[PDB]
Amino acid sequence: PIETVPVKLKPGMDGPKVKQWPLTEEKIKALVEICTEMEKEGKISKIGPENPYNTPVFAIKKKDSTKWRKLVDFRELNKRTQDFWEVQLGIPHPAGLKKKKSVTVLDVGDAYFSVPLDEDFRKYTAFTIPSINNETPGIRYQYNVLPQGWKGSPAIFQSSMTKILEPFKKQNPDIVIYQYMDDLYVGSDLEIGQHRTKIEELRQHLLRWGLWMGYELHPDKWTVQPIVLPEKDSWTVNDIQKLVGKLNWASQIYPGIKVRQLSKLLRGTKALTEVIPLTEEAELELAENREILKEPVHGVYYDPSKDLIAEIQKQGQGQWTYQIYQEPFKNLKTGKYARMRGAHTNDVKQLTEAVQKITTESIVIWGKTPKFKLPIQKETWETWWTEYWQATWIPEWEFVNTPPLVKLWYQ
Amino acid sequence: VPISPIETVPVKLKPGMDGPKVKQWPLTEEKIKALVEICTEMEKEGKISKIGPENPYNTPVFAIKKKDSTKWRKLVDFRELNKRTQDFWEVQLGIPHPAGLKKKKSVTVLDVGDAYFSVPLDEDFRKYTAFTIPSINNETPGIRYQYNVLPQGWKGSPAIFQSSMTKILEPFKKQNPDIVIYQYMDDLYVGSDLEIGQHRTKIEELRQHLLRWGLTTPDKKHQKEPPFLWMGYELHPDKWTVQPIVLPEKDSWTVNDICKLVGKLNWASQIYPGIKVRQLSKLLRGTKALTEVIPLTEEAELELAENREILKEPVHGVYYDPSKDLIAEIQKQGQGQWTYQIYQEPFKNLKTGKYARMRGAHTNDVKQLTEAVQKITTESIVIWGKTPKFKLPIQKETWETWWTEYWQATWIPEWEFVNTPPLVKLWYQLEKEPIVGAETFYVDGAANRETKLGKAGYVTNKGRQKVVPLTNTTNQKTELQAIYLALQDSGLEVNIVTNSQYALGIIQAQPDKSESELVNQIIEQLIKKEKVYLAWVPAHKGIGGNEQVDKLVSA
DNA sequence: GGTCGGCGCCCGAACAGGGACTG
DNA sequence: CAGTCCCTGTTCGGGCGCCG
């Protein structure tokens, strides 16, 4: 008996028509049990081929989670409904969430099943369940309620969400609560003990309205990866050549970098292993360039109207560096990940883990998910990335093939 | 007109477009009798109904012969209706494969007669399926009908029938969970581990369940004894094989004959191991006419003779046993060709295949092997829903060196090394640090966009030097030619300093084959070396001799 | 015959995006 | 400076195979 919020696509843009990719046996069995249960609860309903729209579907298991979780790749549908959840029913991003000592994430996706969906918009939430060896044709469904993983679900439920959080925000005014996709980010400067206690208070405060796990974060301990020059006492031709190439590349970000006096040391056709003493004018150019790398880049600030872009570099030995930016060489944040799951054995698991960590930080700091430039072949990524995904959202990505230049971001 | 027991599928036209209005083709008098005989019978059965002048729509219609039968099939040229009809999402995601079938006690196969004619069309959509049937005389106005069922030739007919058929089979499969039903269009593969007595009972229950909705299961297409003819295979209680494939024996080969030859060789490669179509596909490149006669090359004639000798022996595949692991083993066949076998017990192949797609201008065997593993994995998840364990002709240390040092993310699933020559290895390794006591070559080259002329050469720390003039070349080709000179005129250990990102980006990928002959010559020189160290420095910065030589290789 | 849908392969032409050089 | 072009990679259009 709830009124439906009317939702439309962006003008001059048809619904999503993305094919379903093959799924493993453990994923198909989990999707059939969930969909049959969801159809029994009226959350979804079967459809036919007269609906020309479709969205891929697969299943995941979150970190240390035994229960399967249905996930829909609504990235194409979210691109075609962008004006709804930004212009009309936007969610403000709290700039203090990134400053909390501890931030916990809660999957509130089960609450969206309580609100019905607009009848005219249900045609676009269509999805197909595949069968092993194509035993049976596609078993198609469509959503009758607010689907999990659709950017229009938290916007419609936002009014209902604020009224549920109002008694808790009043008792705890210093706690910051942000809602992105099917997740709820709760941050507080309390001690780690009383923090988890307040989380359980919010869990029971949400259970009494019809809604369970938790994933902790610590944004105050997030570090950046600056550009560092080696501290050698004896320099060879090969050392200074790599140093000049690194400084020449870094000059695109810090315009004050000079390589005039340094590249003068490499003027004779010398052997690479030959030791070269640094001139007086070169020792000053190096120390000054070290000081410019300590300074912050001039004119770098976040623009809410621009999309975020994240580049990742494979440094080997389980090392992975990354940079977030909106305009080239105007990096909003840099960093490096090390010793993640699958280190020294599985590159795809490490890359999947890195993308999840980066996207999570992008939500806490700016409330956006970046578009990734992944250092991997398209066929390699699209084969294994679903095997290691542990998040309810999916960022956009493209595939790059940039051979290593002068190892800029890692010594 | 009576109401069909099957629920109809609501179909619309695309917004802002009207039905088809096309004139009928001139038909032969032998096809006219075949259509009037069928149209008068379909009208009696309620499948088509007469229409008057109030229907302003019309579409062409014809008929083709049925294979191995005197009956004719009615087809409608709905090419104009398909353009203006709404888009449909096809539910047929793929084709079933016998290797994915499990051993069942009893097996039954049946086909529904006239499947499309047993499923009704939308009531509001029957008006757009209007056609004219010409008479034996051109002056006769002709009889005009409209379809009450699914017409053949419409772009929505297969998608509608596949979904409507599944909805009828859902209550039966809900009551009989242990019965496996492979539904592909109208072909039904029914199997169960029930005893042969209760099996035929469930079969007759299904033939009556389908009968309640207007689906007839004739005993002509009924199959109770092996071998079963299913999806173009021969299903035996313990093995399976494709139906006999016939290759043309043309004395003169056209381009279309090779396309039919390659098409059946690819279809045969799923169970016949070792099929190669490398030299036969080299006959299709750069050709324009389908009817153009092309002679067979010596490498193509040898490849065809080997494929014909493989097809002489009988091969068979087994069924899938979920209790045992899945194993896939790959072999390096030719330059750019790969073959694999998926099996659970040794020499009892579930299916075979091949991979030979050339990706990029420069590559190595490790890249091509990784691409093959990915093609096999996706193919395996389609058929069995799991990834097999791989037996790869590559050393564990060889792969370990590759993926740990590559700048791209790359990975292979759980695999083990099989010692089947030829082995996939890396042919050369670029040192990580500069070589002490090795001559240092500062290369680089340039060219002119207009004259297409350029120079390429090097200067070393020992005073060695060379500059070679080049004609009809580019800036990229000269930078490669410079490194090739440094390799040619150096010892077994050499340090090479370049400023070409392009040249460096190709060599660091460790390719062993390229489409450019200059790259292959650089590869051949790298294999002869013992220690090679490349290094990139920015240009126009006055860096070492790389500025002194950049002035020598300016013009 | 010159109907429809699905999947697979092989090819070339059109598209497209980055790097070095030039008015 | 923006304009090319040299290069490489991708995407799609069209032929065949196979099934219904």
Side-chain angles (χ1 to χ4, degrees):
Chain A
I2 315 175
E3 294 175 336
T4 67
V5 178
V7 184
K8 67 152 189 173
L9 304 181
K10 298 196 304 185
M13 212 172 187
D14 200 8
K17 298 180 180 181
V18 193
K19 288 184 176 181
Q20 170 73 47
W21 56 72
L23 303 176
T24 62
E25 183 170 19
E26 59 176 354
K27 292 181 184 296
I28 292 185
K29 293 190 185 302
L31 286 179
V32 174
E33 296 186 9
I34 292 177
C35 289
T36 298
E37 189 71 17
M38 286 180 57
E39 182 184 19
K40 192 173 183 297
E41 307 172 84
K43 301 173 181 178
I44 56 179
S45 58
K46 301 185 177 182
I47 55 179
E50 71 272 5
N51 193 331
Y53 312 116
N54 184 82
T55 304
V57 162
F58 68 111
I60 66 169
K61 288 186 178 181
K62 307 192 67 172
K63 285 190 178 304
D64 305 326
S65 179
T66 309
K67 174 175 292 298
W68 286 98
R69 209 270 193 178
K70 177 167 175 285
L71 183 48
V72 191
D73 192 16
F74 279 138
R75 285 180 295 180
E76 194 68 21
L77 181 63
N78 294 334
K79 281 193 299 179
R80 301 163 184 268
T81 62
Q82 187 174 353
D83 60 348
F84 175 80
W85 45 270
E86 270 185 348
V87 171
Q88 181 178 352
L89 297 171
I91 301 182
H93 178 70
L97 175 58
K98 59 166 173 293
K99 302 173 182 175
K100 296 304 178 183
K101 285 285 178 295
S102 303
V103 177
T104 309
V105 194
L106 285 104
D107 192 0
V108 298
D110 201 16
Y112 303 100
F113 300 147
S114 306
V115 179
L117 188 64
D118 184 68
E119 188 69 30
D120 299 73
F121 191 76
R122 297 178 176 180
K123 316 187 309 300
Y124 306 109
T125 58
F127 63 91
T128 303
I129 293 184
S131 60
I132 301 184
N133 199 18
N134 302 275
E135 169 181 341
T136 68
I139 307 180
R140 292 176 50 81
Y141 294 85
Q142 82 178 17
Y143 269 89
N144 299 322
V145 295
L146 298 185
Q148 283 179 145
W150 175 53
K151 296 187 178 180
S153 299
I156 297 179
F157 197 76
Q158 186 181 3
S159 62
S160 308
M161 187 63 185
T162 308
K163 300 182 179 181
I164 300 177
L165 298 175
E166 200 281 332
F168 194 88
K169 277 190 175 182
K170 182 180 180 181
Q171 297 179 356
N172 308 272
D174 298 325
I175 293 184
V176 169
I177 295 181
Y178 181 59
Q179 180 192 15
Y180 189 72
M181 301 297 293
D182 315 349
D183 296 321
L184 195 69
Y185 299 85
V186 182
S188 67
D189 293 321
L190 299 177
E191 187 257 343
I192 309 181
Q194 289 184 340
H195 176 80
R196 306 180 187 180
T197 298
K198 288 297 181 181
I199 297 298
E200 194 66 28
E201 295 186 8
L202 187 61
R203 289 219 188 104
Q204 309 299 333
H205 197 293
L206 291 174
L207 281 173
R208 65 171 63 105
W209 288 83
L211 181 57
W212 92 107
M213 275 183 167
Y215 184 67
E216 294 182 351
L217 300 172
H218 302 296
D220 73 314
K221 301 306 182 62
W222 286 351
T223 52
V224 295
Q225 179 76 0
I227 304 179
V228 185
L229 306 179
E231 298 281 356
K232 282 186 169 61
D233 63 324
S234 179
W235 301 75
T236 61
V237 173
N238 176 77
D239 286 330
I240 306 177
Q241 282 183 5
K242 287 158 57 182
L243 175 59
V244 169
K246 186 174 185 177
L247 289 171
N248 181 244
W249 208 278
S251 55
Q252 307 175 271
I253 310 172
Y254 306 84
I257 301 298
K258 298 304 174 184
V259 291
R260 301 178 57 184
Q261 299 298 326
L262 278 175
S263 51
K264 281 183 178 180
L265 297 217
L266 330 152
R267 285 180 89 85
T269 344
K270 299 167 175 294
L272 290 181
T273 64
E274 177 181 329
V275 182
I276 293 304
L278 306 179
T279 59
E280 264 280 7
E281 307 86 70
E283 280 279 11
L284 305 182
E285 195 182 44
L286 180 64
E288 181 176 352
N289 284 329
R290 285 202 184 100
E291 213 178 33
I292 302 177
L293 296 181
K294 305 293 184 59
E295 314 276 8
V297 186
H298 178 76
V300 286
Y301 55 87
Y302 167 75
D303 191 343
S305 60
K306 298 180 177 179
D307 293 330
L308 294 175
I309 299 183
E311 296 178 352
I312 307 178
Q313 297 91 44
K314 174 185 176 184
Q315 302 293 340
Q317 297 302 292
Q319 305 281 335
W320 302 81
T321 59
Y322 69 97
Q323 307 82 37
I324 309 178
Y325 65 90
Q326 293 171 314
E327 293 292 336
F329 312 99
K330 302 297 184 181
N331 294 326
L332 298 173
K333 179 179 177 58
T334 60
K336 178 177 66 64
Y337 295 149
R339 309 200 308 181
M340 301 175 302
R341 51 153 185 167
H344 310 92
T345 171
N346 196 323
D347 275 334
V348 184
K349 180 184 294 184
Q350 296 182 85
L351 191 57
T352 298
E353 185 66 26
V355 174
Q356 295 171 181
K357 302 169 85 68
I358 294 166
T359 308
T360 296
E361 300 177 4
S362 304
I363 299 169
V364 173
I365 303 176
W366 308 282
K368 281 186 168 186
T369 58
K371 186 184 180 185
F372 286 81
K373 289 179 175 294
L374 297 178
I376 186 178
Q377 202 70 16
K378 175 173 183 296
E379 286 72 25
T380 303
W381 179 257
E382 294 191 345
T383 300
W384 309 108
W385 80 266
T386 61
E387 281 297 287
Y388 314 101
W389 202 254
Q390 300 168 330
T392 64
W393 33 254
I394 309 179
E396 292 210 319
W397 52 58
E398 62 190 23
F399 310 100
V400 302
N401 195 342
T402 298
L405 3 135
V406 211
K407 49 181 180 181
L408 179 58
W409 303 106
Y410 189 67
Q411 191 70 218
Chain B
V1 182
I3 300 183
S4 178
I6 307 176
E7 279 212 351
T8 186
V9 175
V11 182
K12 306 177 183 178
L13 292 182
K14 293 191 175 184
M17 290 198 288
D18 200 8
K21 293 167 296 182
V22 189
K23 191 174 174 57
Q24 181 68 37
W25 289 82
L27 294 179
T28 318
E29 294 188 348
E30 56 181 354
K31 301 183 183 63
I32 290 177
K33 177 188 176 183
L35 287 180
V36 178
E37 191 193 276
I38 295 300
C39 289
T40 51
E41 180 77 306
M42 293 194 305
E43 178 192 341
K44 182 181 179 180
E45 296 171 333
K47 298 168 184 175
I48 55 178
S49 300
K50 302 185 184 303
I51 50 180
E54 74 284 345
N55 195 330
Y57 308 116
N58 187 66
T59 182
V61 66
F62 61 95
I64 65 176
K65 61 167 185 175
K66 266 191 173 183
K67 295 184 178 181
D68 304 327
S69 182
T70 62
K71 303 175 299 181
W72 289 73
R73 183 195 295 102
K74 181 180 180 300
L75 296 174
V76 188
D77 187 9
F78 271 140
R79 274 183 287 183
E80 275 292 336
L81 182 60
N82 297 330
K83 293 180 180 181
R84 299 182 172 185
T85 312
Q86 69 167 37
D87 295 327
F88 297 91
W89 185 265
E90 318 291 333
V91 290
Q92 196 64 49
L93 307 179
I95 303 175
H97 199 272
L101 304 174
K102 308 180 186 184
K103 274 195 170 185
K104 295 301 180 181
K105 276 192 175 183
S106 310
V107 169
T108 308
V109 178
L110 54 88
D111 290 353
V112 176
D114 296 1
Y116 288 174
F117 302 144
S118 298
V119 179
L121 191 62
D122 193 64
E123 186 69 277
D124 311 69
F125 198 80
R126 301 186 222 260
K127 56 174 58 61
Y128 307 102
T129 58
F131 58 93
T132 43
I133 297 298
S135 302
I136 207 67
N137 301 329
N138 300 275
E139 65 184 26
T140 305
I143 320 295
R144 306 189 61 254
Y145 301 97
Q146 71 176 16
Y147 265 94
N148 297 90
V149 295
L150 295 184
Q152 302 199 7
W154 187 35
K155 77 172 186 178
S157 298
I160 283 181
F161 172 56
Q162 290 169 358
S163 182
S164 302
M165 181 67 183
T166 307
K167 189 59 205 64
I168 301 180
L169 297 177
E170 176 185 348
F172 188 88
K173 285 193 278 191
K174 187 176 182 178
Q175 300 171 358
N176 309 271
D178 299 325
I179 295 185
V180 182
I181 299 184
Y182 265 71
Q183 171 194 350
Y184 185 87
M185 200 71 69
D186 54 356
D187 191 273
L188 289 180
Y189 171 93
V190 188
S192 64
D193 284 329
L194 296 178
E195 200 68 287
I196 196 58
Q198 294 83 354
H199 173 80
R200 286 187 265 270
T201 298
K202 296 298 182 180
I203 291 300
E204 192 63 25
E205 293 178 27
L206 184 63
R207 299 177 78 258
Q208 292 178 344
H209 191 106
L210 296 174
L211 192 57
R212 286 188 295 171
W213 303 81
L215 296 176
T216 60
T217 60
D219 290 327
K220 172 190 175 184
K221 286 295 185 298
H222 204 289
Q223 301 178 15
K224 311 169 187 176
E225 303 273 6
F228 305 92
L229 295 184
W230 175 83
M231 296 298 301
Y233 305 97
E234 299 183 6
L235 295 181
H236 297 69
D238 288 328
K239 53 185 178 180
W240 66 266
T241 181
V242 299
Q243 293 184 6
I245 313 168
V246 181
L247 296 186
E249 297 180 348
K250 289 288 189 301
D251 49 359
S252 181
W253 297 83
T254 63
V255 181
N256 185 87
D257 293 329
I258 301 298
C259 268
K260 299 202 301 294
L261 176 63
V262 177
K264 288 192 174 183
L265 285 177
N266 297 332
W267 165 258
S269 62
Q270 62 172 324
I271 188 58
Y272 284 89
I275 268 62
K276 286 178 289 186
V277 210
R278 167 71 173 183
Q279 308 298 330
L280 286 175
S281 298
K282 283 191 174 183
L283 305 177
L284 303 177
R285 58 178 62 173
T287 321
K288 66 273 182 178
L290 271 171
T291 60
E292 182 177 356
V293 49
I294 172 172
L296 302 182
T297 325
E298 184 184 13
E299 308 91 60
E301 287 163 341
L302 178 59
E303 196 183 41
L304 212 167
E306 293 177 2
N307 285 336
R308 280 219 172 98
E309 193 173 9
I310 297 177
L311 294 180
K312 292 178 180 180
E313 68 170 17
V315 305
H316 71 86
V318 305
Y319 295 115
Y320 175 62
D321 186 11
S323 61
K324 292 179 293 189
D325 278 321
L326 209 61
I327 298 180
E329 182 177 353
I330 316 183
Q331 290 85 26
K332 175 185 172 66
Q333 222 181 7
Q335 301 302 332
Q337 294 182 98
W338 305 81
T339 42
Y340 59 94
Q341 301 86 30
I342 308 177
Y343 61 89
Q344 298 184 281
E345 290 289 69
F347 302 105
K348 298 184 178 182
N349 295 328
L350 294 154
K351 70 180 305 300
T352 60
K354 60 175 181 60
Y355 173 72
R357 185 173 184 176
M358 175 65 173
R359 295 188 182 273
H362 325 292
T363 180
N364 57 35
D365 289 329
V366 183
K367 288 181 179 180
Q368 301 184 6
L369 176 63
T370 302
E371 297 170 3
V373 174
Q374 296 165 183
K375 179 195 181 304
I376 297 167
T377 295
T378 299
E379 177 181 343
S380 296
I381 301 186
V382 170
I383 301 181
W384 305 285
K386 59 176 296 182
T387 301
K389 192 185 181 185
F390 285 94
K391 296 184 177 180
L392 305 177
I394 175 182
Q395 298 278 14
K396 214 73 187 183
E397 295 75 18
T398 296
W399 169 257
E400 176 73 7
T401 300
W402 167 255
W403 78 266
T404 53
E405 298 292 339
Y406 202 18
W407 62 85
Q408 300 274 108
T410 184
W411 179 75
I412 285 182
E414 181 172 338
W415 69 284
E416 65 179 9
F417 160 67
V418 53
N419 187 10
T420 298
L423 298 187
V424 168
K425 69 172 187 174
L426 298 176
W427 293 97
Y428 56 94
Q429 190 96 12
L430 301 181
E431 303 298 273
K432 296 186 180 61
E433 302 297 333
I435 315 155
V436 291
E439 200 169 355
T440 306
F441 286 58
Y442 297 71
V443 273
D444 126 79
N448 184 274
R449 273 191 173 185
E450 279 72 18
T451 71
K452 300 297 182 178
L453 305 179
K455 297 181 177 59
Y458 57 85
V459 178
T460 80
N461 65 311
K462 287 164 59 182
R464 190 187 310 266
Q465 184 176 330
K466 167 183 284 191
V467 172
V468 178
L470 302 172
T471 65
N472 191 24
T473 188
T474 69
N475 273 328
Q476 292 77 35
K477 294 185 179 182
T478 55
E479 294 161 355
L480 285 175
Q481 191 87 37
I483 300 182
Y484 176 66
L485 292 174
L487 293 171
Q488 275 194 149
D489 313 335
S490 53
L492 294 172
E493 308 176 359
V494 50
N495 303 319
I496 301 182
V497 179
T498 176
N499 53 347
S500 177
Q501 302 181 22
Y502 164 80
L504 189 67
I506 299 182
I507 304 178
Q508 287 180 344
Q510 298 174 289
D512 56 33
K513 182 186 177 182
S514 176
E515 300 174 354
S516 177
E517 183 62 28
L518 179 56
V519 182
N520 289 319
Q521 293 179 345
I522 296 177
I523 293 169
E524 190 178 30
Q525 277 294 328
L526 288 172
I527 303 176
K528 294 181 179 179
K529 301 293 183 179
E530 290 183 354
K531 291 185 177 181
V532 178
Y533 174 79
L534 275 173
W536 178 94
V537 293
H540 308 142
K541 288 297 177 179
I543 294 185
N546 201 76
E547 184 197 23
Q548 261 89 332
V549 60
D550 237 314
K551 208 172 187 301
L552 297 168
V553 302
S554 60

